[PDB]
Symmetry: C4
Subunit: 31 residues, 4 copies
């Protein structure tokens, strides 16, 4: 269950990287 | 407690999807 | 340690609510 | 593994502080 929790936290970190990707996209629209 | 933690992580993932919807709403205002 | 982890996840959820607060403030600047 | 999970949660919180850094930078482009 700890190693299910770590691999939920990895796919939270992936959906923060998708944070990062939108924040280059908005900074084209605004930068 | 592990399967309480996994179901806090699910309702963090839900509030990243609300990330996603706001980052659609801001791209109507800016796109 | 599980109920330390749950209360790190509470203070991640709080800093997603600060997500919501800024996505109110940017939507004043743009809405 | 609990104290591996807490230290994934710290490096999630760090990548939320980077939320905070960008939401200073966009609030220069817009404020």
């Amino acid at each position: 269950r700890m190693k299910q929790i770590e691999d939920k936290l990895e796919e939270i970190l992936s959906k923060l990287y998708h944070x990062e990707n939108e924040x280059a996209r908005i900074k084209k629209l605004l930068x």
